[PDB]
């Protein structure tokens, strides 16, 4: 009948996993006890986005809005424009499309409009330099997120264009049982509608923490001014630690609020980046959900990914349990033979998923 | 009626480039930071200057021919980048040049060796300079 | 307490799982400690210094890749328990079921 | 009204087809974010 | 056509001329050239 | 109303228009009443700080070595206990009022000469104008650098901060008034207000409307929300050097190069 | 006729003449440039009804399996 | 169905705006294609 879920937890993942698996799902008891029960505006907008890129899907929203029945169709893609409500930035909507774009009948060319940054959702640079590189490791050769206009909160006004030219049968099998060596640190510090000095000052704060390291540190100054700088002033910084040997990356990001010192923010992201590296084995915690899902939908082969003991947190477990409900696939974890660390190897067998929407 | 002074300095008596690829390359390899004031030797008509003017805080174009100086002026008048160009006219070996971070030059080959050492001895000299010399020199 | 078993026991909650062996994906940014604690902890870059720095035919090359993958699958399954093996790959061909 | 709309549609597809055909004949016989640098100035 | 060139140079303001001595003078022929006290008082 | 001039400090009754007291001082540049209305403090061009008492009708204390150069600016916190003085020696010095004498507390050394120093009404921000055409905002509590304002072709001559500490106005010798937001330092609007250098800009209390005076002898009334000039006031014959706004906002007092003190009252 | 009215209207708003005259904020002037433009094009003095056909065309200009069936109240 | 001939253009407000912009640009540059005495 229907695979039933509870609450608003992992709303995007459960819908995305249903779309890839093709199995209808039911999400019930969405904020039942809250004063404003049911789906939020941005959740309803996300469902509309799912339909613009699929065909033949049926989405029922209950009279109270507290229950959703989703019967997925085929992923078709194509060119479209999506208006993101101000409750969430564009990255809230761009991120799930990364899971569906390579397995589509037609190339995804989606134009997203709205706020381009927030404190809780993926930024433009997190996607461009933090997630999309993981996709290329899985065989998505051509993927691009062009930023046409930057829009900072609360008024937004930004525009990003997601273009995924690569249509593939399925992700390649992953074999990463080592700890990548970080070759250099790169990042982007950006600002809109304000003086360049803020961008320079953040770079000084970040470089202060990272100068002790033995690798090169080169942070870009992304100063936006004029018509494309959006409607509200804002600034932020994103740092990426790169491993050129196998094209791996770890990143942290944050944006500045009113009354915040640019130098302090640069130190926060630099400190968080070192926290992320210490907690990571082969991918960061913010990249781990994407890597696991792609390995689940690979060929029917045992792919291996090294994970740190710290990465096995509350979020990791719920992701695995949700995958088992949809795909029935169990992740097997084995200790590494080394004694320097307590890492583990997460071995997942692919379900033999294939891109059947693409005409041959 | 400025002929009195300009004729006392100049008499109002060259091989022009015809390949856009090299001109774009010279600017590209310069890697002009947005906060860099650039000194441009041999601006010519202004093909290279206009590209530099787009990316630079300010551009000081040093020229020796009064006729070509007007050509540069007419190409930049009434434009957003007019306020960021300072055209200088006359022999520039003798004078004390301003401070510049990058030097892009289609130098006259006659003044190649004086120019190479002027930049070297300039107080607080530029960090990078893209100069066009002959193959032997 | 093997965490692998604790993950797939739906009766236990994820919070109850972590502590014995030792919130939501809509928030993309992961949890971090406070800046003052983090700033003190990364006063020195120690504890992360380790992290920082022929086949004759094209046909045979592809066949080698397939065989190497098939060898990897066999090695992992052998390490796994026979009950663990059945739960991951399922019932392999040749099984009388 | 529909007459004008049809001409624009048929004009669009023909241009795309010739663009697609030209690419194919070309094939038989670097930076993806460079443009972002220009939009920054405005 | 030289007179047309001369008028164009004089028309523009961002032009300076070098005499044989190396001095910096404007087109008209005069030597081209804030203090806290002056601006406040 | 206390009017500081070169060589004398005179004090007037706004009602009778008759000078009540006169004090001999140096080349006074900035004067401000202390809370209670019973004391006055001057910043002379010689770097001296002079404090006067109205009831005693005499000078209480003089600090000869307050600054090495002209004390161009001087401001008081809302509590009235702390004094901030800017000088051409490129330093800001904080002073305390202890029972009355002035004690030096701290020195903030900046890169260029200082023309104006203003303290926010909530005592959270400190805006400082520099001779390098920039205005630096600090956190008064911690003295941590917060923002730098760029956009003036010529040095900023006056600064004022809105009553709710959201907007900050800057007037410069380039004849432009720029209204900035303290949240991020973005320039809301630049107004070509006057035909000459603008000497003083003040917010009307409890409102975002502000006044401006310039060397062209004009005092203009502006709307801080619509960015429009409400009223042009042509009364002075020469430069208007100083301007002051009543705490109530009922009237505005302007003094000019023509030795005339004119009171503008709201009708 | 119309030229006299156009010249008079521009002058009243300060859109014509010398600016350095010895012995209106720019934004308000741009508003005048707008209002002057629609007023002095009678075809879009006022034209007779029916000379233009804008209203019809814009109406025509305004004028996939499955979908979201939102039953929320 | 197909139509044999080009449809008669409709002069909407945008088409007017583009036309007057070209006219104003031509006047501003004083670029007139007009006959002159020889």
Short mmCIF file of N, CA, C and O in Angstrom, two decimals, chain G:
data_model
loop_
_atom_site.label_atom_id
_atom_site.label_comp_id
_atom_site.label_asym_id
_atom_site.label_seq_id
_atom_site.Cartn_x
_atom_site.Cartn_y
_atom_site.Cartn_z
N UNK G 1 1.98 74.67 -31.89
CA UNK G 1 0.80 74.10 -31.25
C UNK G 1 1.21 73.09 -30.18
O UNK G 1 1.33 73.43 -29.01
N UNK G 2 1.42 71.84 -30.59
CA UNK G 2 1.91 70.83 -29.66
C UNK G 2 3.34 71.13 -29.23
O UNK G 2 3.71 70.92 -28.07
N UNK G 3 4.16 71.63 -30.16
CA UNK G 3 5.54 71.98 -29.82
C UNK G 3 5.58 73.08 -28.77
O UNK G 3 6.40 73.03 -27.85
N UNK G 4 4.72 74.09 -28.90
CA UNK G 4 4.65 75.13 -27.89
C UNK G 4 4.23 74.56 -26.54
O UNK G 4 4.79 74.92 -25.50
N UNK G 5 3.23 73.67 -26.54
CA UNK G 5 2.80 73.05 -25.29
C UNK G 5 3.87 72.14 -24.72
O UNK G 5 4.07 72.10 -23.50
N UNK G 6 4.58 71.40 -25.57
CA UNK G 6 5.68 70.57 -25.09
C UNK G 6 6.79 71.43 -24.50
O UNK G 6 7.30 71.14 -23.42
N UNK G 7 7.17 72.50 -25.20
CA UNK G 7 8.24 73.36 -24.70
C UNK G 7 7.84 74.04 -23.40
O UNK G 7 8.65 74.16 -22.48
N UNK G 8 6.59 74.51 -23.31
CA UNK G 8 6.13 75.15 -22.08
C UNK G 8 6.13 74.17 -20.92
O UNK G 8 6.56 74.51 -19.81
N UNK G 9 5.64 72.95 -21.15
CA UNK G 9 5.58 71.97 -20.07
C UNK G 9 6.96 71.60 -19.56
O UNK G 9 7.19 71.53 -18.35
N UNK G 10 7.91 71.38 -20.48
CA UNK G 10 9.27 71.05 -20.06
C UNK G 10 9.89 72.19 -19.26
O UNK G 10 10.57 71.95 -18.26
N UNK G 11 9.65 73.43 -19.68
CA UNK G 11 10.24 74.57 -18.99
C UNK G 11 9.71 74.70 -17.57
O UNK G 11 10.46 75.02 -16.64
N UNK G 12 8.41 74.44 -17.38
CA UNK G 12 7.83 74.57 -16.05
C UNK G 12 8.48 73.62 -15.06
O UNK G 12 8.68 73.96 -13.89
N UNK G 13 8.83 72.42 -15.52
CA UNK G 13 9.49 71.43 -14.68
C UNK G 13 11.01 71.61 -14.63
O UNK G 13 11.68 70.81 -13.97
N UNK G 14 11.55 72.61 -15.31
CA UNK G 14 12.98 72.82 -15.30
C UNK G 14 13.77 71.84 -16.13
O UNK G 14 14.94 71.59 -15.84
N UNK G 15 13.15 71.26 -17.16
CA UNK G 15 13.83 70.28 -18.00
C UNK G 15 14.60 70.91 -19.16
O UNK G 15 15.32 70.19 -19.85
N UNK G 16 14.47 72.22 -19.39
CA UNK G 16 15.12 72.89 -20.49
C UNK G 16 15.74 74.20 -20.02
O UNK G 16 15.30 74.80 -19.03
N UNK G 17 16.78 74.63 -20.73
CA UNK G 17 17.43 75.90 -20.47
C UNK G 17 18.80 75.73 -19.83
O UNK G 17 19.31 74.62 -19.64
N UNK G 18 19.39 76.87 -19.50
CA UNK G 18 20.69 76.89 -18.83
C UNK G 18 20.53 76.52 -17.36
O UNK G 18 19.55 76.90 -16.71
N UNK G 19 21.50 75.78 -16.83
CA UNK G 19 21.53 75.43 -15.41
C UNK G 19 22.44 76.33 -14.59
O UNK G 19 22.21 76.48 -13.38
N UNK G 20 23.44 76.95 -15.21
CA UNK G 20 24.36 77.84 -14.52
C UNK G 20 23.81 79.26 -14.39
O UNK G 20 24.59 80.20 -14.22
N UNK G 21 22.49 79.43 -14.49
CA UNK G 21 21.91 80.76 -14.42
C UNK G 21 22.19 81.36 -13.05
O UNK G 21 21.83 80.80 -12.01
N UNK G 22 22.84 82.53 -13.05
CA UNK G 22 23.18 83.25 -11.83
C UNK G 22 22.35 84.52 -11.77
O UNK G 22 22.35 85.31 -12.72
N UNK G 23 21.65 84.72 -10.65
CA UNK G 23 20.81 85.89 -10.46
C UNK G 23 19.78 86.01 -11.59
O UNK G 23 18.58 85.87 -11.36
N UNK G 24 14.73 71.85 -8.57
CA UNK G 24 14.01 70.58 -8.57
C UNK G 24 15.00 69.42 -8.48
O UNK G 24 15.86 69.27 -9.35
N UNK G 25 14.88 68.61 -7.44
CA UNK G 25 15.76 67.46 -7.29
C UNK G 25 15.59 66.51 -8.46
O UNK G 25 14.50 66.38 -9.03
N UNK G 26 16.69 65.84 -8.83
CA UNK G 26 16.74 65.09 -10.08
C UNK G 26 15.67 64.01 -10.14
O UNK G 26 15.10 63.74 -11.20
N UNK G 27 15.39 63.37 -9.00
CA UNK G 27 14.39 62.30 -8.99
C UNK G 27 13.03 62.83 -9.41
O UNK G 27 12.33 62.19 -10.21
N UNK G 28 12.63 63.99 -8.90
CA UNK G 28 11.35 64.58 -9.29
C UNK G 28 11.34 64.94 -10.76
O UNK G 28 10.30 64.88 -11.42
N UNK G 29 12.50 65.33 -11.31
CA UNK G 29 12.58 65.62 -12.73
C UNK G 29 12.28 64.37 -13.56
O UNK G 29 11.55 64.44 -14.55
N UNK G 30 12.82 63.22 -13.15
CA UNK G 30 12.55 61.99 -13.88
C UNK G 30 11.07 61.64 -13.86
O UNK G 30 10.53 61.11 -14.84
N UNK G 31 10.39 61.92 -12.74
CA UNK G 31 8.95 61.76 -12.71
C UNK G 31 8.28 62.64 -13.76
O UNK G 31 7.31 62.23 -14.40
N UNK G 32 8.80 63.86 -13.94
CA UNK G 32 8.25 64.75 -14.97
C UNK G 32 8.50 64.19 -16.36
O UNK G 32 7.62 64.26 -17.23
N UNK G 33 9.69 63.64 -16.61
CA UNK G 33 9.97 63.05 -17.91
C UNK G 33 8.96 61.95 -18.21
O UNK G 33 8.51 61.80 -19.35
N UNK G 34 8.59 61.18 -17.19
CA UNK G 34 7.54 60.18 -17.39
C UNK G 34 6.22 60.85 -17.75
O UNK G 34 5.70 60.65 -18.85
N UNK G 35 5.71 61.70 -16.86
CA UNK G 35 4.38 62.29 -17.06
C UNK G 35 4.30 63.06 -18.37
O UNK G 35 3.26 63.05 -19.03
N UNK G 36 5.38 63.74 -18.76
CA UNK G 36 5.39 64.42 -20.05
C UNK G 36 5.23 63.43 -21.19
O UNK G 36 4.59 63.72 -22.20
N UNK G 37 5.81 62.23 -21.04
CA UNK G 37 5.85 61.30 -22.17
C UNK G 37 4.47 60.73 -22.50
O UNK G 37 4.08 60.70 -23.67
N UNK G 38 3.72 60.27 -21.49
CA UNK G 38 2.39 59.73 -21.80
C UNK G 38 1.44 60.84 -22.24
O UNK G 38 0.60 60.63 -23.12
N UNK G 39 1.55 62.02 -21.63
CA UNK G 39 0.59 63.09 -21.91
C UNK G 39 0.65 63.53 -23.36
O UNK G 39 -0.39 63.81 -23.97
N UNK G 40 1.85 63.61 -23.93
CA UNK G 40 2.02 64.18 -25.27
C UNK G 40 2.02 63.13 -26.37
O UNK G 40 2.40 63.45 -27.50
N UNK G 41 1.60 61.90 -26.08
CA UNK G 41 1.33 60.90 -27.11
C UNK G 41 -0.16 60.60 -27.11
O UNK G 41 -0.61 59.71 -26.38
N UNK G 42 -0.98 61.32 -27.88
CA UNK G 42 -2.43 61.08 -27.82
C UNK G 42 -2.85 59.72 -28.33
O UNK G 42 -3.94 59.25 -27.99
N UNK G 43 -2.02 59.08 -29.16
CA UNK G 43 -2.46 57.87 -29.85
C UNK G 43 -2.51 56.67 -28.90
O UNK G 43 -3.38 55.81 -29.04
N UNK G 44 -1.59 56.60 -27.95
CA UNK G 44 -1.59 55.50 -26.99
C UNK G 44 -2.76 55.61 -26.03
O UNK G 44 -3.20 56.71 -25.70
N UNK G 45 -4.36 66.70 -25.84
CA UNK G 45 -5.02 66.01 -26.94
C UNK G 45 -5.26 64.54 -26.59
O UNK G 45 -4.39 63.89 -26.01
N UNK G 46 -6.44 64.04 -26.94
CA UNK G 46 -6.84 62.67 -26.65
C UNK G 46 -7.42 62.05 -27.91
O UNK G 46 -8.22 62.69 -28.62
N UNK G 47 -7.02 60.82 -28.20
CA UNK G 47 -7.51 60.15 -29.39
C UNK G 47 -8.93 59.65 -29.22
O UNK G 47 -9.44 59.46 -28.12
N UNK G 48 -9.60 59.45 -30.36
CA UNK G 48 -10.95 58.94 -30.35
C UNK G 48 -10.95 57.47 -29.92
O UNK G 48 -9.94 56.78 -30.07
N UNK G 49 -12.06 56.98 -29.38
CA UNK G 49 -12.09 55.57 -28.95
C UNK G 49 -11.95 54.63 -30.13
O UNK G 49 -12.53 54.84 -31.19
N UNK G 50 -11.17 53.57 -29.92
CA UNK G 50 -10.99 52.52 -30.91
C UNK G 50 -9.76 52.66 -31.78
O UNK G 50 -9.47 51.74 -32.55
N UNK G 51 -9.02 53.77 -31.68
CA UNK G 51 -7.84 53.94 -32.53
C UNK G 51 -6.74 52.96 -32.16
O UNK G 51 -5.97 52.55 -33.03
N UNK G 52 -6.65 52.57 -30.89
CA UNK G 52 -5.64 51.63 -30.42
C UNK G 52 -6.28 50.28 -30.12
O UNK G 52 -7.49 50.18 -29.89
N UNK G 53 -5.45 49.24 -30.12
CA UNK G 53 -5.90 47.88 -29.86
C UNK G 53 -5.01 47.21 -28.82
O UNK G 53 -4.78 46.00 -28.88
N UNK G 54 -4.51 47.98 -27.86
CA UNK G 54 -3.64 47.43 -26.83
C UNK G 54 -4.40 46.50 -25.89
O UNK G 54 -3.91 45.43 -25.52
N UNK G 55 -5.61 46.90 -25.49
CA UNK G 55 -6.32 46.20 -24.43
C UNK G 55 -6.62 44.76 -24.85
O UNK G 55 -6.51 43.83 -24.05
N UNK G 56 -7.02 44.57 -26.11
CA UNK G 56 -7.30 43.22 -26.57
C UNK G 56 -6.07 42.33 -26.57
O UNK G 56 -6.12 41.20 -26.08
N UNK G 57 -4.95 42.83 -27.10
CA UNK G 57 -3.76 42.00 -27.24
C UNK G 57 -3.23 41.55 -25.89
O UNK G 57 -2.82 40.40 -25.72
N UNK G 58 -3.21 42.46 -24.91
CA UNK G 58 -2.73 42.07 -23.58
C UNK G 58 -3.63 41.00 -22.98
O UNK G 58 -3.14 40.08 -22.30
N UNK G 59 -4.94 41.09 -23.21
CA UNK G 59 -5.84 40.04 -22.74
C UNK G 59 -5.51 38.70 -23.36
O UNK G 59 -5.49 37.67 -22.68
N UNK G 60 -5.24 38.68 -24.67
CA UNK G 60 -4.85 37.43 -25.32
C UNK G 60 -3.50 36.95 -24.81
O UNK G 60 -3.29 35.74 -24.65
N UNK G 61 -2.57 37.87 -24.56
CA UNK G 61 -1.26 37.49 -24.04
C UNK G 61 -1.38 36.81 -22.69
O UNK G 61 -0.70 35.81 -22.42
N UNK G 62 -2.25 37.33 -21.81
CA UNK G 62 -2.47 36.69 -20.52
C UNK G 62 -3.01 35.28 -20.70
O UNK G 62 -2.59 34.36 -19.99
N UNK G 63 -3.93 35.10 -21.63
CA UNK G 63 -4.51 33.79 -21.90
C UNK G 63 -3.44 32.79 -22.31
O UNK G 63 -2.41 33.16 -22.87
N UNK G 64 1.34 17.33 -19.59
CA UNK G 64 1.45 17.30 -18.13
C UNK G 64 0.32 16.47 -17.52
O UNK G 64 -0.84 16.85 -17.58
N UNK G 65 0.70 15.34 -16.93
CA UNK G 65 -0.24 14.41 -16.32
C UNK G 65 -0.03 14.41 -14.82
O UNK G 65 1.10 14.41 -14.34
N UNK G 66 -1.14 14.41 -14.08
CA UNK G 66 -1.07 14.51 -12.64
C UNK G 66 -0.84 15.93 -12.18
O UNK G 66 -0.68 16.86 -12.97
N UNK G 67 -0.83 16.11 -10.87
CA UNK G 67 -0.61 17.42 -10.30
C UNK G 67 -0.83 17.39 -8.80
O UNK G 67 -1.17 16.36 -8.22
N UNK G 68 -0.63 18.55 -8.18
CA UNK G 68 -0.88 18.72 -6.76
C UNK G 68 -2.37 19.01 -6.58
O UNK G 68 -2.89 19.99 -7.13
N UNK G 69 -3.05 18.15 -5.83
CA UNK G 69 -4.46 18.33 -5.51
C UNK G 69 -4.50 18.82 -4.06
O UNK G 69 -4.53 18.02 -3.13
N UNK G 70 -4.50 20.13 -3.88
CA UNK G 70 -4.46 20.75 -2.56
C UNK G 70 -5.88 20.91 -2.06
O UNK G 70 -6.64 21.74 -2.57
N UNK G 71 -6.24 20.11 -1.06
CA UNK G 71 -7.57 20.14 -0.46
C UNK G 71 -7.61 20.96 0.83
O UNK G 71 -8.60 20.91 1.56
N UNK G 72 -6.55 21.72 1.12
CA UNK G 72 -6.49 22.48 2.36
C UNK G 72 -7.58 23.55 2.38
O UNK G 72 -7.95 24.11 1.35
N UNK G 73 -8.10 23.82 3.58
CA UNK G 73 -9.18 24.77 3.76
C UNK G 73 -8.69 26.21 3.63
O UNK G 73 -7.96 26.71 4.49
#
